[PDB]
Amino acid sequence: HETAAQRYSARLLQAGYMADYLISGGTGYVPEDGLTAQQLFASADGLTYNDFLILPGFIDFIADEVDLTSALTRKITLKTPLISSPMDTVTEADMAIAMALMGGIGFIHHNCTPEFQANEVRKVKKFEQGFITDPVVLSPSHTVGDVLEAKMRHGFSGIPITETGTLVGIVTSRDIDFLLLSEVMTPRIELVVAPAGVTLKEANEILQRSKKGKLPIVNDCDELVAIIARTDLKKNRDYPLASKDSQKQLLCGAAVGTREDDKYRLDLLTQAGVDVIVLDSSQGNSVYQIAMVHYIKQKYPHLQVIGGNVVTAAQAKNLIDAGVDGLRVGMGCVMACGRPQGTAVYKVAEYARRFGVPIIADGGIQTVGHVVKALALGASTVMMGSLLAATTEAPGSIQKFVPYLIAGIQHGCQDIGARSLSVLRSMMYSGELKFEKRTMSAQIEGGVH
Amino acid sequence: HETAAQRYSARLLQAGYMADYLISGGTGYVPEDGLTAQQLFASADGLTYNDFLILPGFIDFIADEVDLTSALTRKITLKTPLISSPMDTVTEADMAIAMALMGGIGFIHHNCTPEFQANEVRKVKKFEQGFITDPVVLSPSHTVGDVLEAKMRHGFSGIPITETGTLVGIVTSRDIDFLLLSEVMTPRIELVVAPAGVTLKEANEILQRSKKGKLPIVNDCDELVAIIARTDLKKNRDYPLASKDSQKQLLCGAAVGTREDDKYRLDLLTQAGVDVIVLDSSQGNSVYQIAMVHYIKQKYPHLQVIGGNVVTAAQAKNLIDAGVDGLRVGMGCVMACGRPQGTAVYKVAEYARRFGVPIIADGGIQTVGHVVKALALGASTVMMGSLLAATTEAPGSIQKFVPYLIAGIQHGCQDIGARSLSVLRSMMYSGELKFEKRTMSAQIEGGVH
Numbered sequence: 001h002e003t004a005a006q007r008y009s010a011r012l013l014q015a016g017y018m019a020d021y022l023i024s025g026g027t028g029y030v031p032e033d034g035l036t037a038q039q040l041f042a043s044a045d046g047l048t049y050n051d052f053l054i055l056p057g058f059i060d061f062i063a064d065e066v067d068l069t070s071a072l073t074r075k076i077t078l079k080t081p082l083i084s085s086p087m088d089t090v091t092e093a094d095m096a097i098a099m100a101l102m103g104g105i106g107f108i109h110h111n112c113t114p115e116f117q118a119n120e121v122r123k124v125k126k127f128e129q130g131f132i133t134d135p136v137v138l139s140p141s142h143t144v145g146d147v148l149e150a151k152m153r154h155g156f157s158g159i160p161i162t163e164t165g166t167l168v169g170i171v172t173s174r175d176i177d178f179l180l181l182s183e184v185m186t187p188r189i190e191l192v193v194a195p196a197g198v199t200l201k202e203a204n205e206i207l208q209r210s211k212k213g214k215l216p217i218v219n220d221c222d223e224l225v226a227i228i229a230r231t232d233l234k235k236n237r238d239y240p241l242a243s244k245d246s247q248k249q250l251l252c253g254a255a256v257g258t259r260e261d262d263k264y265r266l267d268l269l270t271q272a273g274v275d276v277i278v279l280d281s282s283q284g285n286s287v288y289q290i291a292m293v294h295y296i297k298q299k300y301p302h303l304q305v306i307g308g309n310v311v312t313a314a315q316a317k318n319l320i321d322a323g324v325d326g327l328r329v330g331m332g333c334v335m336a337c338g339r340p341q342g343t344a345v346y347k348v349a350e351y352a353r354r355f356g357v358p359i360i361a362d363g364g365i366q367t368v369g370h371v372v373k374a375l376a377l378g379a380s381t382v383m384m385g386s387l388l389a390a391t392t393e394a395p396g397s398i399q400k401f402v403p404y405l406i407a408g409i410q411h412g413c414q415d416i417g418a419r420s421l422s423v424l425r426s427m428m429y430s431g432e433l434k435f436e437k438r439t440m441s442a443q444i445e446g447g448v449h
Numbered sequence: 450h451e452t453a454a455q456r457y458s459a460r461l462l463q464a465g466y467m468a469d470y471l472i473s474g475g476t477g478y479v480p481e482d483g484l485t486a487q488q489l490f491a492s493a494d495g496l497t498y499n500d501f502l503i504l505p506g507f508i509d510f511i512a513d514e515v516d517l518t519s520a521l522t523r524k525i526t527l528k529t530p531l532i533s534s535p536m537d538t539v540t541e542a543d544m545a546i547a548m549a550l551m552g553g554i555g556f557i558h559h560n561c562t563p564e565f566q567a568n569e570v571r572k573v574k575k576f577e578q579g580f581i582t583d584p585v586v587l588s589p590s591h592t593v594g595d596v597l598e599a600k601m602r603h604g605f606s607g608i609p610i611t612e613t614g615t616l617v618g619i620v621t622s623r624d625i626d627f628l629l630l631s632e633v634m635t636p637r638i639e640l641v642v643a644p645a646g647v648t649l650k651e652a653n654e655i656l657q658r659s660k661k662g663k664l665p666i667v668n669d670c671d672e673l674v675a676i677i678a679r680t681d682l683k684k685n686r687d688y689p690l691a692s693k694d695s696q697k698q699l700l701c702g703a704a705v706g707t708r709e710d711d712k713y714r715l716d717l718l719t720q721a722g723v724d725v726i727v728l729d730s731s732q733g734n735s736v737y738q739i740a741m742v743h744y745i746k747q748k749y750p751h752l753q754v755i756g757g758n759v760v761t762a763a764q765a766k767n768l769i770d771a772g773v774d775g776l777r778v779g780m781g782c783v784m785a786c787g788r789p790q791g792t793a794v795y796k797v798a799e800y801a802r803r804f805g806v807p808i809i810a811d812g813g814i815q816t817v818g819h820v821v822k823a824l825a826l827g828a829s830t831v832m833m834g835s836l837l838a839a840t841t842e843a844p845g846s847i848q849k850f851v852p853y854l855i856a857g858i859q860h861g862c863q864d865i866g867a868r869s870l871s872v873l874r875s876m877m878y879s880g881e882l883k884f885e886k887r888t889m890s891a892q893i894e895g896g897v898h
């Protein structure tokens with residue numbers, strides 16, 4: 001970790017022209033200008049995000065070397081400091097897949113029956129990046145008029161056929177478009193198809209020879225195990241920001257309530273193999289939400305748990321020493337309680353950091369500037385709210401839209417002169433990064449309104 | 450009364466796992482975060498209720514165990530911290546009954562002849578829950594046309610009859626629908642009258658057998674004393690939040706002016722039996738209000754007196770040491786005097802408290818958040834203003850509406866972690882409850898505008 005004075009003096013000696021390094025070290029002087037974060041929050045006002053700025057630094061790297069690696073919980077790590085919020089208006093299994101493919105995570109909302117949430121988790125854990133998730137397969141006992149309508153029900157129309165479930169051939173639109181006819185098309189006589197477990201490059205080369213649209217994957221027992229459709233192999237992108245677990249399949253989380261009736265919901269989700277739980281609660285520091293934490297850590301010692309909403313170091317203490325591995329730092333964005341967001345994030349992050357429990361800055365983030373700030377104050381990850389609602393993956397497109405935010409954060413953390421979010425926060429806690437307040441007159445000019 | 454550190458450490462030892470109780474007591478450490486109330490008002494910015502928040506605490510009880518018992522004056526106590534304001538657009542005998550049935554009190558306005566206010570008090574003191582207050586009795590000498598029109602005057606039409614006023618029979622629409630006679634209607638024959646005063650639950654059984662619409666209440670003198678109507682027995686609710694005096698009938702108050710002409714108004718109201726007087730005045734600390742106070746305490750030593758409006762500890766001193774038993778803490782919510790309401794409530798409550806003289810936070814309260822605040826700052830009761838105008842009791846129904854505010858206050862004082870308003874204030878004065886300021890940027894984002 002090199003100070004801006006160390007970076008300038010070293011890189012100036014790399015460019016080329018004594019008792020300067022020997023009389024003040026690599027700290028070759030810089031003017032003190034603006035406030036350190038510890039001073040900015042000392043006046044005890046409710047500084048929100050619109051209210052402060054980050055004074056620019058020294059730049060010695062390009063805007064595409066700003067490592068974004070962030071930490072979600074004590075053991076889960078992410079390539080992107082973003083998250084989708086556990087709301088019915090935002091996250092379901094489609095957006096949970098989309099976020100994980102962009103190096104983040106998503107949390108499945110809990111405004112549903114417990115079985116539905118476990119099904120939506122299962123739907124994410126089994127994604128495979130080119131195979132069809134949960135293929136529809138039909139029985140020869142069923143009349144093809146009740147396969148022809150499925151095109152009116154699900155929209156797709158090339159259906160594989162077998163005795164009841166995941167062998168005979170396929171029925172597709174070209175078997176039906178000239179005609180109710182019981183079922184009388186394509187026995188087990190398909191062309192070149194995947195005989196066992198296969199790769200996506202191998203399927204791309206087989207589909208090129210075969211020219212057909214569906215490709216079964218069968219097993220050694222010579223029955224269907226998965227299926228491919230050509231239309232997806234035409235488009236499936238590279239995703240280096242993978243967000244995969246130790247079994248090389250997507251990370252995803254689930255929200256759970258804190259009620260007595262929720263040990264059952266938490267079972268079904270842990271049987272679906274969910275990676276992390278967020279305890280959804282308007283105020284996390286309650287006796288029965290601490291009982292819920294002690295209960296999870298006693299029964300499923302592998303499951304990561306993120307504590308419910310807090311905004312003080314006293315709440316953060318009681319949830320941490322209960323054993324939680326994260327924290328949603330956000331509340332009050334009519335109520336009579338809460339805290340101004342910017343002060344909440346700074347105070348909880350600075351407290352949690354003493355043990356290593358990264359936090360999650362949820363609430364009232366609505367620009368990429370607010371994201372860069374929340375990350376400079378101490379938040380480890382920012383939970384995108386209704387900002388993602390009315391994108392086409394919500395119950396623009398998330399896959400095309402997340403790169404915009406990434407490039408914006410990278411440009412920001414480049415103007416600040418911090419080559420990786422971990423360094424941004426180190427540069428903040430050590431007082432090397434400087435901040436300035438704003439009068440209302442100075443934000444009505446150049447922003448806000 | 451136990452602190453968040455005492456409650457967490459004790460309740461953790463109820464669940465189970467040393468020289469940690471023996472080296473710092475039940476105060477097992479919590480982070481200092483936010484301002485105590487004494488610090489919040491030290492800056493001498495005049496705050497109002499929109500300017501601060503209450504940092505959330507530790508929760509260990511349900512939102513329905515938040516005892517709301519508050520103290521109106523040194524001797525009158527209320528089950529609910531609400532009041533209806535003494536305004537013509539708000540309080541009259543109907544709303545005064547409605548507030549007392551919801552565990553609060555109401556103060557009858559004084560924009561009237563003194564006789565009218567004494568009548569509206571008399572109407573409130575004599576309520577009796579099931580019985581008709583002030584029944585209409587007609588004379589056997591009246592022609593039916595002057596009874597039949599009363600249905601056009603008062604709307605009801607089952608009129609009991611006797612010589613002039615509070616039985617010799619009844620007359621109802623069924624006696625009159627076919628017709629003008631002068632007397633042909635039901636003479637004394639009535640199906641199980643109440644022979645004396647009776648329990649409302651006994652009358653509920655009598656109406657079930659009798660099937661008639663009216664039930665006379667009579668006396669051993671063989672004459673009327675009260676009457677019951679069947680339609681009210683179908684709907685009378687439980688009211689456990691009673692607000693009743695030692696004589697087991699409703700509490701109510703009256704506003705009086707401070708003029709020389711008002712010893713007469715104060716007589717008529719004290720003859721009607723009013724429980725508490727509020728001295729209405731734009732500024733309470735005047736020689737002729739202190740004369741009015743000394744005068745009441747010299748002539749009616751039983752009557753509770755609430756001092757007219759103040760906003761400083763210097764005003765509060767002069768009225769307290771005059772002998773008043775309460776205080777409307779509110780002024781100026783264009784006139785060149787006054788105070789920002791949040792600072793007024795805190796300063797007057799903190800001063801009065803030295804003697805035990807609870808105050809009443811009147812002015813500019815327009816949400817349930819502001820109510821929870823005014824109660825956290827020191828106000829003992831909050832006087833609902835034009836917030837209650839355009840309800841059906843205003844000269845959408847107060848009986849149905851007050852439970853909303855109650856549940857809201859209870860949810861608030863649950864998030865704050867204080868099991869009973871008396872504990873909320875104890876937790877504030879002892880500096881355990883922490884507050885935060887809010888820049889305009891922090892309330893332009895999180896509600897309010």
Ligand SMILES: Nc1ncnc2c1ncn2[C@@H]1O[C@H](COP(=O)(O)OP(=O)(O)OP(=O)(O)O)[C@@H](O)[C@H]1O
Nearest residue numbers: 132134135136156157158159160173213229231232
């Ligand atoms: N067996 C299947 N079960 C469920 N969905 C399927 C199946 N086969 C294809 N799909 C859906 O179709 C998408 C891509 O294939 P495509 O749309 O070309 O199917 P298709 O059957 O060939 O459609 P169509 O016959 O109308 O042209 C997949 O991403 C998936 O959403």
Ligand SMILES: Nc1ncnc2c1ncn2[C@@H]1O[C@H](COP(=O)(O)OP(=O)(O)OP(=O)(O)O)[C@@H](O)[C@H]1O
Nearest residue numbers: 158170171172173174175186190191212213214215
């Ligand atoms: N892997 C396969 N091997 C052999 N024949 C196949 C295979 N997959 C599909 N078929 C058959 O080949 C024909 C074309 O099917 P295809 O996969 O192209 O779907 P389709 O409905 O015809 O697609 P599209 O509507 O876009 O033209 C159909 O008779 C179908 O049953």
Ligand SMILES: Nc1ncnc2c1ncn2[C@@H]1O[C@H](COP(=O)(O)OP(=O)(O)OP(=O)(O)O)[C@@H](O)[C@H]1O
Nearest residue numbers: 581584585605606607608609622662678679680681
């Ligand atoms: N004798 C009465 N004197 C005064 N008020 C009365 C009297 N009888 C009824 N009321 C008023 O009328 C309300 C409804 O009473 P009730 O339903 O018995 O009316 P009613 O006599 O049957 O009228 P109607 O014959 O027109 O239906 C009561 O709550 C009360 O406010």
Ligand SMILES: Nc1ncnc2c1ncn2[C@@H]1O[C@H](COP(=O)(O)OP(=O)(O)OP(=O)(O)O)[C@@H](O)[C@H]1O
Nearest residue numbers: 607619620621622623624635639640661662663664
């Ligand atoms: N307590 C009573 N005992 C005996 N007769 C009564 C009594 N009260 C009313 N009546 C008579 O019984 C008849 C019906 O009276 P009731 O009170 O049921 O009519 P109402 O409810 O006022 O009229 P409506 O049915 O239109 O609302 C009338 O002749 C009335 O004078």
